[PDB]
Amino acid sequence: VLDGPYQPVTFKPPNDYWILINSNSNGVVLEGTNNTDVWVAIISIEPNVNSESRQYSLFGVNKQITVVNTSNKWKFMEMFRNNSNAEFQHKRTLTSSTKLVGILKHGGRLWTYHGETPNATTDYSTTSNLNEISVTTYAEFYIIPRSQESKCTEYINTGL
Numbered sequence: 284v285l286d287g288p289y290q291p292v293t294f295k296p297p298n299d300y301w302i303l304i305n306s307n308s309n310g311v312v313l314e315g316t317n318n319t320d321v322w323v324a325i326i327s328i329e330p331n332v333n334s335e336s337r338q339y340s341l342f343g344v345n346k347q348i349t350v351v352n353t354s355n356k357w358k359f360m361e362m363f364r365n366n367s368n369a370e371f372q373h374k375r376t377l378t379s380s381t382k383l384v385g386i387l388k389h390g391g392r393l394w395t396y397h398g399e400t401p402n403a404t405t406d407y408s409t410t411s412n413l414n415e416i417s418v419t420t421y422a423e424f425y426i427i428p429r430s431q432e433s434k435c436t437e438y439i440n441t442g443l
């Protein structure tokens with residue numbers, strides 16, 4: 284009885300709900316911003332990719348990122364910046380057999396998962412304008428209350 288799946292859309296996630304995205308494919312999985320101090324994008328790289336340059340459109344703008352993933356797992360790079368004049372930088376990585384990606388607004392912070400399945404964990408970026416963060420998803424997603432975060436963490440790590 285999952286709350287979803289919902290099709291790709293731009294929306295403003297409410298505080299204290301996990302958005303859990305079920306990416307089947309490579310490319311941008313999600314991007315979000317409050318236009319002040321957060322811009323984030325999660326980029327998907329398929330298994331067994333040797334080093335190459337690839338293009339991604341972030342907030343309507345083309346960016347070249349060199350990628351690599353010699354794992355049998357999928358790789359999700361979290362790209363980040365805290366100013367509109369700065370370039371995106373690689374902040375964190377989630378290496379996943381499940382292909383599920385999470386984002387949550389809670390407690391003054393923006394949360395994602397990083398590390399490697401089945402031991403992926405949450406970490407944050409800080410913002411002074413949390414409520415104004417909107418996201419665009421590029422794949423189906425589900426919505427899971429923070430009160431059920433252990434269930435979300437299980438899905439991230441072991442699959443729907």
Ligand SMILES: CC(=O)N[C@H]1[C@H](OC[C@H]2O[C@@H](O[C@H](C)[C@H](N)C(=O)O)[C@H](NC(C)=O)[C@@H](O[C@@H]3O[C@H](CO)[C@H](O)[C@H](O)[C@H]3O)[C@H]2O)O[C@H](CO)[C@@H](O)[C@@H]1O
Nearest residue numbers: 299387388389390391392393394395404405406407429432
């Ligand atoms: C350890 C833990 O529970 N971690 C959670 C994570 O919790 C996020 C919150 O971390 C707080 O600090 C912990 C819980 C301590 N009690 C503490 O006070 O240090 C943050 N407190 C800070 C930064 O001082 C808290 O932030 C506050 O939240 C309240 C209401 O939630 C209010 O918004 C305040 O303005 C704000 O300062 C949280 O950031 O949550 C993640 C995501 O669910 C879990 O994965 C993780 O396990």
